[PDB]
Amino acid sequence: VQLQESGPGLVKPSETLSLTCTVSGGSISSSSYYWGWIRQPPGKGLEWIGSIYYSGSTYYNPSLKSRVTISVDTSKNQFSLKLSSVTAADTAVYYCARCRPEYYFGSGSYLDFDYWGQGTLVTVS
Amino acid sequence: DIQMTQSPSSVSASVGDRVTITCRASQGISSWLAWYQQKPGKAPKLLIYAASSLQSGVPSRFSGSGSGTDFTLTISSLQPEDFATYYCQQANSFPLTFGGGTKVEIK
Amino acid sequence: QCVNLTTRTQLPPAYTNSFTRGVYYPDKVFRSSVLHSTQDLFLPFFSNVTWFHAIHVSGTNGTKRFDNPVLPFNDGVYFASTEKSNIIRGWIFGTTLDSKTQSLLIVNNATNVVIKVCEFQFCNDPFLGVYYHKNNKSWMESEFRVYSSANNCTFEYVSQPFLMDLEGKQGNFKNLREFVFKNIDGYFKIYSKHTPINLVRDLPQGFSALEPLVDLPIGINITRFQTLLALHRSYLTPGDSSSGWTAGAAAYYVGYLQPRTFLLKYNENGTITDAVDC
Ligand SMILES: *[C@@H]1O[C@H](CO)[C@@H](O[C@@H]2O[C@H](CO)[C@@H](O)[C@H](O)[C@H]2NC(C)=O)[C@H](O)[C@H]1NC(C)=O
Ligand SMILES: *[C@@H]1O[C@H](CO)[C@@H](O[C@@H]2O[C@H](CO)[C@@H](O)[C@H](O)[C@H]2NC(C)=O)[C@H](O)[C@H]1NC(C)=O
Ligand SMILES: *[C@@H]1O[C@H](CO)[C@@H](O)[C@H](O)[C@H]1NC(C)=O
Ligand SMILES: *[C@@H]1O[C@H](CO)[C@@H](O)[C@H](O)[C@H]1NC(C)=O
Ligand SMILES: *[C@@H]1O[C@H](CO)[C@@H](O)[C@H](O)[C@H]1NC(C)=O
DSSP states (O other): OEEEEEOOSSOOTTOOBOOEEEEESSOSSSOOOOEEEEEEOSSSOOEEEEEEOSSSOOEEOSTTOTTEEEEEETTTTEEEEEESOOOTTOOEEEEEEEEEEOSSSSSOEEEEEESOOOOEEEOOO | OOOOEEOOOSEEEOSSOOEEEEEEOSSOOOSOOEEEEEOTTSOOEEEEESSSOOOTTOOTTEEOOOOSSOOEEEESOOOTTOOEEEEEEOOSSSSOOBOOOEEEEEO | OOOOOOOOOOOOOEEEEEOSOOEEOOSSOOOOSOEEEEEEEEOOSSEEEEEEEEEEEOSSSOEEOOOOOOEEOTTEEEEEEEESSOOEEEEEEESSOSTTSOEEEEEEOSSOEEEEEEEOOEEEEEEEEOOOBTTTTBOOOOOOEEESOOEEEEEEEEOOOEEOOOOOOOSSOOOEEEEEEEEETTEEEEEEEEEOOOOSSSOOOSOOEEEEEEEEEOOOOOOEEEEEEEEBOOTTSOSOTTTOOBOOEEEEEEEOOEEEEEEEEEOSSSOEEEEEEO
16 A cells, blocks of 8 residues: 655675565555565666565575575564675665455465555665 | 566657567466556556556556567557656566566657 | 265254345446435345354364355355355356256366366365475465366366465454355356454454456356365374365355345445445
8 A cells, every 4th residue: 555665874795784664554464465575776677586475484586595584573564674795786776565466366466566665775885 | 487588679759659569588478477667766667467458547558469478568659758668577487587678768 | 086075073054144234236337425226136134144164173072064065046146254264265056067067167276266167077075175294384285176077168267376375373263255146147247345354253243345346158057056165184184085184164154135125325435335125
């Protein structure tokens, strides 16, 4: 329904990258849907980094899979993405996403994205 | 392990014309695809889902056809608000992949 | 190939009152701030509906129930389901459920939703199944025994792949799904709605409006229908096939339709706030 991503600004090389996604207008628990993160570097290009489900069942992108973790804080409507180590080419603009739901039965999300939100910028060095 | 190529790049058009974009796959996906539009300084918004459909209240000047290894998108006419980059994405396997994008500008 | 499973207990069914619920949009026109009288097939207010369980318990005596009987269609069906996880999948419709006449099939199997109209030969106990592995801590699914002979198919529709949970929790129910099935002219019409709840037993009392979902041109003759469920199977249910299995926790309610006249009240956007019968 509505999202507002948040996080820090300038970072340091090979540190942990913090991030937070506060869902507004929707119960993060009273749902059966999926959530995900998406990256866009400056210039040209898009990449999908990870997708999560509440109460476990995490997935990760095959490329750059070693240093990525995703967590959800079910107490509030918040989830976070952690990078243990970063390089000089990891700077981009990051977005939250919601996976479009199923049509006939409910309880299911397709492999496509809708209802995004505004993005923040993370530099390097 | 799905790879895509988007053949047109930086097309120029006038206010009333017809423009077309093709997005080529490498595997044998079966009529599942998605198209995206990105106005500058915003977040992408969805335009067409599945092979050929439309969500929400996007103007009906947007329509594309489909096949098993080729795809296309064409718009009937332009307006001064149609100036952006368009993207194609697959909806088949776990490693989601995105296209290089194509730019449409008005002359 | 399919088998009969036999470790069931015995008990008679029950009945539960339906409150003011089961109304749907009867046409395509748009109105606002009006009181409109309509004649159509509806479900009467305060009417008997029938209750069906799927629950297994141990420790105290023996109580295992797994009910999916063959039921008549008459003029139409109102279907409601309450579940903590995904335990109902779909339906088979037909008139003789044998190889001499056509049938209709709607099924979900955790990757795709399949709609078929075809000649089949269903066997006595159709069911789907899952498995719980200890080494994986994963709920992987492999079972499909619903028919043994399909031929001469006319319509076929297979949908876009998706993901879904199969975990299976314990506690209070937290979903409610309602469907309405009607067969008129040469057309099959399906309406649906979903809502969240936090009950422990029985059907909620309130009001909701149903919206059109699917219209299919098929042209079959329908007189009876049956339900399909899913059952678990793990290391804690020993024995052998047809005698080793456990049930989950789910329930559903069924009711029929009759020709009535109603006085619906539209809102200032086009939503049916309430209704009255006579
Ligand atoms: C399952 O139980 C039925 C109960 O009679 C067994 O009998 C078959 O019932 C079906 C009706 O759905 C008939 O079409 C078959 O001709 C019956 N077979 C026989 C041999 O009488 C059925 O065999 C059982 N299935 C098994 C044991 O696999
Ligand atoms: C769920 O049922 C669908 C029914 O279509 C299955 O889809 C077919 O699966 C076979 C299995 O190898 C494939 O060869 C076909 O190509 C699939 N059909 C289409 C149209 O792609 C699906 O595999 C089933 N899934 C599970 C987990 O049982
Ligand atoms: C519902 O059924 C019960 C028993 O089956 C019956 O006693 C009761 O009168 C019925 N309710 C009606 C007919 O409104
Ligand atoms: C699940 O268990 C099977 C059997 O041991 C194994 O082959 C598989 O790798 C495990 N993980 C899955 C299916 O994700
Ligand atoms: C459907 O088939 C049954 C089979 O006996 C038949 O009696 C009936 O007339 C047919 N048509 C309808 C509308 O039920």
